[PDB]
Amino acid sequence: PIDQLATDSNYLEVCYILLNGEKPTQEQYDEFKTTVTRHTMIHEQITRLFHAFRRDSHPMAVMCGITGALAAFYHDSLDVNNPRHREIAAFRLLSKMPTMAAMCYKYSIGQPFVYPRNDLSYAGNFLNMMFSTPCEPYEVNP
């Protein structure tokens, strides 16, 4: 039940459930997590693409434009018939979407992009890339 997941789980565990069909074993979750975190960075060349968009553009339009351009970069996982390809493409999306989303916001307001931190949770790391500023370390309210 959704109420049970929103109350007692977390986003990645729920991502694991949706993608795998069962709640994860502690070993399965930790492995899943490790992988998701190791690939949260977006290729530096994709960042340049962000600068070709107008600053007044809607973040959602920028979000679409960047996602639809991912195939021109990560061209090593496009064969949908190849399970290895599908898993890799899957993981790249799951890991990178947050980084992408936060950059749209930062770009929209004129603030510098913030790199993901492997020490923070999915939700905390997202709030960090949304609100952190070089001016001082940012602390996410629990």
Next chain:
Amino acid sequence: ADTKAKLTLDGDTAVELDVLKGTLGQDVIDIRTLGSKGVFTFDPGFTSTASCESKITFIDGDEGILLHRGFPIDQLATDSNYLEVCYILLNGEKPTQEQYDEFKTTVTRHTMIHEQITRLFHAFRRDSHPMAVMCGITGALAAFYHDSLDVNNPRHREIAAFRLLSKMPTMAAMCYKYSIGQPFVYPRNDLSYAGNFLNMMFSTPCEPYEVNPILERAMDRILILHADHEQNASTSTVRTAGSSGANPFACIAAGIASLWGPAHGGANEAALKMLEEISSVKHIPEFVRRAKDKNDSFRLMGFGHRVYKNYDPRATVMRETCHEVLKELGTKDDLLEVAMELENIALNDPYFIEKKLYPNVDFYSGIILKAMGIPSSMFTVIFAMARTVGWIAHWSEMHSDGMKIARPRQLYTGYEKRDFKSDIKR
């Protein structure tokens, strides 16, 4: 208490004029409604015309007195700090601990410059003078922060004011970094105005940077001492541009161009020509250049000033600070002992005593900046950076007065009306 009553003008008949009194200085002959009679005065440069009523800064030239909201400059440079002095200039009184902390909080929260403005920096040439880059960026601020340009809107004015006060330092330091090929440094909310500035100037990713307390304090006094200087040409430019309704940023950008005017207004070798004759006649370790250079004297190099008669009241603390700084940066300034000799020359050489070319605040400020490792092209940028709060103060005062638009007259001496017949075909 003499002619504090009235005065009269006579061309063939009489006209009575009020004579407003000041709290300090000279009283003035009110001529506001004269124009409504056709009678105009003539005064290029306005040196016999009070262009406004002000309460910000008071100067008595011959007495060597400089006051800011009544507070003697020596007292502010010694016991205050730049932001508190900014608060005084902008608000009229020293702040309550609660008022200062609020002011500070606001200034720090808006020190970052929009990321798109940073790109603008890269379109400039690397060899460009930081001062020219500083003007170009300030004058472009209106194309970004387009949400605070209505000078008639007090909320707009306060916001524009704060954005300038907070961002000028970040801007100044980026000009330097860009000029030398080093990466821009983001402001740190944990550091003081002066410390945070020195950090964005000298910090490198290669390692954390630590600001010397003596250097920090020295820079703070350099800023304090340049915070304001009354109705000079550059401030009057800010006031005049603002009277027409030019946006806040455009006004600050003009005061900057106006502030370095003398630096390039002087020949490509004004005070520079002899800075090249230090190679063929360097047989004498001093009178070779910066001691035989000034044919056409300059207050730009730290000697003399049209405002004060005998001494610059600002130079007192700067000279003492100057001793402290050199006496700290150790063996790296001993070579810069010529300063003691230029001062010696300015005090004892008959040429300087004659012209009254006393070392002004920029002479010592100059020594302190050179001691800290700052290129001379960054001196007026720093002075302009410091001067911006005063410019904001006069501009804001002008706007509370009712923005009396500068609409002067002219003595027309050209052609009477004559018909036009063209003799070309192109």
Next chain:
Amino acid sequence: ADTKAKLTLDGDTAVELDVLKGTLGQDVIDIRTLGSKGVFTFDPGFTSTASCESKITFIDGDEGILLHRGFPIDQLATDSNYLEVCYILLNGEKPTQEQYDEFKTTVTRHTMIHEQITRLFHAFRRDSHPMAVMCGITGALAAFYHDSLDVNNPRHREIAAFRLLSKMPTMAAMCYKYSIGQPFVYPRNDLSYAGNFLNMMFSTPCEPYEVNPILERAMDRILILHADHEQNASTSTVRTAGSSGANPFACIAAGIASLWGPAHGGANEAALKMLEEISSVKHIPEFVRRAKDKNDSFRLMGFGHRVYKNYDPRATVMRETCHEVLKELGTKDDLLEVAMELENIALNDPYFIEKKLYPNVDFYSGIILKAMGIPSSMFTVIFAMARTVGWIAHWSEMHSDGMKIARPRQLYTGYEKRDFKSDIKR
């Protein structure tokens, strides 16, 4: 010719002041000595003070007179072209063919702007108001043209004047192409000053652009009619900044900002607020917006002008040109028939008739520019671009006079000297 000799000022002792006479306009009282004699007038706004002697432009507001070097604006507008007017304003005399060819060739020789400057444009947001980009670019010029900044060197002023004169229409057109996302167009040597601007504004690489002779003359006229308008606010700013040493490029940029001041100084809805109430009360095809808008009247929309009592002399030829243009661009302006109704309203409404809100030169300029497809965001850019010559001439005249530095007085009404005791501890 009654007392064009002398007059007296009485405060405590009678001071003898010479009366100076013009060739047209009112006489002035020379008070450049009162200052030293310890006497200061008080004129915020300079309405009873002549800031200079000038031979460029003469205005007689009440009798609708406007002369540039003695020539009536009507004649120049109908019998000259923008470039010859430029020559006249700058040199004081109409040019011979030879002088004109040489002048036109010099201008043509410097129309292109450095390609690096072209890289500054791309750092501005595409959504930037074209005027903010203009102040931005013009204020960045000094960093690129650093060899023509010696305001005290006559060769530099000349170089600068031709640089500003030659490149403004290039930059102005780039501001437009940039804002609409079309490629920049290079200056064309074979086109007129006006034909070149139209081509730089509207041509694309997809088809040959045909310069309409009618619109070309109409543009030329808008330009001539905006060449100079005496000592107004923005020209006071140019002269003031200039007298303080500021480089020529910075001076024009300050003028540009001072000129569009009224447009944003308004309120984000000054003359805009009612430009939005044309959706709920549009039951009446006119008095809905631009006929019920002006609560706070504006000469910016083309109605009234502080300078002219009954009418704007520049509007005569502009109105005629307006007829020609609409009567040419055929079925594309018929909708812009409201113009006839706004004029009708300005001429016959008791309110307008009372407060003399006659249609001025920009009322007709706007209709033409609107009819030309040019967006309103560009109107002030084109006016400033044209006014640049008037700014150059005045700035140059200020520099031939001896650059009398703007150093006005103030009536100080602030605190008396007081001691500072830090109220804070942080």
